[model samples]
Target: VTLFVALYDYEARTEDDLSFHKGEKFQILNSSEGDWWEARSLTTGETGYIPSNYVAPV
Candidate 1:
């Protein structure tokens, strides 16, 4: 499993997007999609897609 850290705050623009604050940790579930990645927020236990550029692999 890959872990990632939010580099900046991101608001969920759609129902499928995951909104997260900077410094939050996420468990990467999928990286096959271009520009977006599937992840679960460690803080809220919510699962959704986040922008690939908004997070950095940790």
Candidate 2:
């Protein structure tokens, strides 16, 4: 499993997108799709796709 932290707050643009705040941690599930990455929020237990550039590896 890979862990990452959000660099800035991001709001979901679609139903499948994930909303996250700065400094929030996420468990990266997938990153083979390019700009969008699939991850689960460690704090909220929610899973959805987030912008890869909005986060940094923890």
Candidate 3:
């Protein structure tokens, strides 16, 4: 499981109700898709799909 940092704020309203703010770090669970990825926030302890563009590798 690789870790990543959020480059922008993302709100997962429907998908898992998870969300993260810019600079927030998370663990990358899945990134096989083009736009969305599955990640778990290190601080919030929430897991869900987020836009890949909103984050970068830590």
Candidate 4:
């Protein structure tokens, strides 16, 4: 089974309201240096950069 992660407090500079949701999962794609990771949201189906601090290993 696939697991999903929530993106809390994710907002653009212009947006004031923070949004969060479940059912978002990303493939390993490619790993950069250090604790940085790039994952795609299975919900929105969009790929973006996420810090290790915001992401927890499930």
- What TM-scores do the predictions have? 0.90, 0.90, 0.79, 0.49
**Winner on TM-score (1 vs 3):** 1
Ranking by TM-score: 1, 2, 3, 4
In model 1, where do residues sit more than 4 Å from their true spots? none
> Which residue runs of candidate 4 sit more than 4 Å off their true CA positions?
1-4, 12-25, 32-35
Pairs clashing within candidate 2: none
Question: What lDDT score is found at residue 14 in candidate 4?
Answer: 30
Model 2 local distance difference test score: 0.89
lDDT of 3 by residue, 1-58 (tens): 5888888887777845468689888788888968888888778787888888888887
| lDDT scores in order | 0.90, 0.89, 0.79, 0.48
lDDT, candidate 1, at 15? 99
List the lowest-lDDT window of 10 residues for candidate 3.
11-20
Q: Cα RMSD (Å) between model 4 and the true structure?
A: 5.2
Which one wins by TM-score: 2 or 4? 2
Q: On residues 1-58, what C-alpha lDDT tens digit does candidate 4 reach at each position? A: 3243544445423332223444345554545546555666665666666544455546
Ranking by lDDT: 1, 2, 3, 4
What are the per-residue Cα lDDT tens digits for candidate 2 across 1-58? 5899999999998999999789899988889858989999878898999999998887
